[PDB]
């Protein structure tokens, strides 16, 4: 029920002349938008990515992002000139903005910035501020950025008003894709280990909440290890479970919302 909307921006500055900015947008774990450096326009990656916004509303929202990217590129380049020779290229900025939707028609917004892979700056309330751990020289860039009242007013409007209003639109428009149920397929295998290591591969399930356990009849095997959730291309999830002998008797059981109650047990 709690969806987190994310605008992820990644910008690379190789030298004084070379630069690149690419963005991607996620509603939960489904990609909604993409904005390559090559493109002048933000792209839709779902039929419902525009949400409940009108065409005139979207264009107005896109225009300010277009102006933003150009301005962002120049502002960093000027800040490098301002900090030289204490900081120099190559430079990587990562930006993470959006809001988390909650029950009872409420939300909470965020804007987080990372420098050279480390979180340094957030937008909080009415101004930019540095987080604990950040180097002290950032006080000057932040001072200069906070001087820009218009940028501050816009970011406030985006985080407080525009983002939550937009996401509620997406949730209404993309209900079928967001509430989609995909059945997992399970297959078993073995590889030699430092006893043999039985592997239970589970693939093609949505949503992400899954339950995978090795079981000797009713007894749930304690030595079961869950791996990492790995993505598929067709927007489904992959996961493997391992148990560290005597294999005749135990089975990989999988619970999921898609199966409609009836779990699948797969015997060795």
């Amino acid at each position: 029920k709690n969806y987190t909307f994310r605008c992820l921006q990644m910008s690379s500055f190789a030298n004084r002349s070379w630069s690149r900015t690419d963005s991607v947008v996620w509603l939960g774990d489904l990609q909604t938008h993409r904005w390559s450096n090559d493109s002048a326009t933000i792209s839709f990656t779902k039929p419902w990515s525009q949400g409940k916004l009108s065409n005139q509303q979207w264009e107005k929202l896109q225009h300010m992002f277009q102006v933003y990217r150009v301005s962002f590129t120049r502002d960093i380049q000027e800040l490098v000139k301002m900090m030289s020779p204490k900081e120099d290229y190559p430079i990587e900025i990562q930006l993470s903005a959006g809001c988390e939707m909650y029950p009872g028609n409420a939300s909470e917004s965020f804007l987080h910035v990372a420098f050279q892979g480390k979180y340094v700056v957030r937008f909080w309330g009415t101004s930019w501020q540095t987080v604990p751990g950040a180097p002290s020289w950032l006080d000057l860039p932040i001072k200069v950025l906070n001087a820009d009242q218009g940028t501050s007013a816009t970011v406030q409007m985006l985080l407080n008003d525009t983002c939550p209003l937009f996401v509620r639109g997406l949730l209404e428009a993309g209900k079928s894709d967001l509430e989609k149920q995909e059945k997992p397929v399970a297959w078993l295998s073995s590889v030699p280990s430092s006893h043999r290591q039985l592997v239970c591969h589970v693939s093609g399930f949505y949503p992400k909440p899954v339950w995978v356990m090795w079981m000797r009849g009713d007894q749930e095997q304690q030595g079961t290890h869950r791996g990492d959730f790995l993505p598929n291309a067709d927007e489904t999830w992959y996961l493997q479970a391992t148990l560290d002998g005597e294999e005749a008797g135990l089975a990989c059981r999988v619970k999921h919302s898609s199966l409609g109650g009836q779990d699948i047990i797969l015997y060795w």
Partner: T-cell receptor
Amino acid sequence: AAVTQSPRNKVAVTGGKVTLSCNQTNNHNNMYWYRQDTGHGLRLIHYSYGAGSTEKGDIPDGYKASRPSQENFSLILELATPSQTSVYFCASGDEGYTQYFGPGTRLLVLE
Amino acid sequence: TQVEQSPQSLVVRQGENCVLQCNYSVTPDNHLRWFKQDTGKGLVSLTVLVDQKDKTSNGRYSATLDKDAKHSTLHITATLLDDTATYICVVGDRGSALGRLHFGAGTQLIVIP
């Protein structure tokens, strides 16, 4: 919030060194050198984000810039040419957008 | 250029009003400033407009700004001899020190007493 310039008015010859100075006691980090010519807006030559650093403006050729301290920003014409006969304005500012302009300096380069 | 002023020059009689235009293509356009410059003199700030649809007043001077139209006007009410000067439109592309000012070539005003 005053910005001073010296000299106010200068006559120089082709090939000589010509140094135009600018001074502000406003503790402003940022200083900018412009030139004004008829039928043109003011055009940025050089600017400085702080002591011991200069950055190229839109029309930097022929000029070198020096920021010895917070207070002073200098425009240095090593080999002065007639094409540098102009009015030169200096300006300073803090983190805000306002640039505070000096009185202007009139340079004329004769053969 | 990115900042264009109109007319190039004009001559008015004492006590007549006049309107000076500014048109620009500057992106972004944070604020717009009108300067008065006497012959052989420096730059005196008359007003600075800031909003999307803005209007300002400074005695006999008043100015409008329309950011959608990227357009500004300077009205001088009941002109005097002292108004004989060049009037300069300037667009700043940021609301901070990171910005660059974009200057118009100016409009010459001559008032006949």
